[PDB]
Amino acid sequence: LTEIHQELETARKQQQSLQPVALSWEKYQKQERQLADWLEIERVKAELHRLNIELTKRMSEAKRVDTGALVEAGADLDDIPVYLQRLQELTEEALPEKLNRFLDYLNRSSD
């Protein structure tokens, strides 16, 4: 049961780390689309610099608590899609399944 609980806790931590990356990626997409439509510019480029800094910090944090799937990718903008996919793959299937499993075994050892 403790093994299962550790699995669930790791999955929860991974998802919590990932979500800020998705938020920052959406903000980066908004800024990049604004800049592309524009094409004064230096301010947009500095905003993109700050957003990429936050992006990479979030990427490093996400790689921090990861135990696998994100190991292949890196903390770079071109690796945004894979991280995003992972988030979905968690909120869909890793977290629920794990959670269900836990809530099963907890009742197996107690009742």
């Binding site: 099963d104 009742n107 197996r108 009742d111």
Partner: protein, 46 residues
């Protein structure tokens, strides 16, 4: 490999003690509740 035969017995026991469907069936008043619920939901689904 008996794991599929030892783990599986665990799943059945957990299913028996946890799944609402099996719990309801094993309860000694199952026919009465099911009959009422089936009749209730037969006519309306809202």
């Amino acid at each position: 490999m008996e794991e599929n035969t030892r783990q599986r017995t665990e799943n059945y026991i957990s299913a028996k003690n946890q799944h609402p469907a099996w719990i309801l069936l094993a309860t000694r008043r199952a026919p009465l509740v099911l009959s009422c619920l089936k009749t209730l939901f037969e006519k309306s689904h809202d």
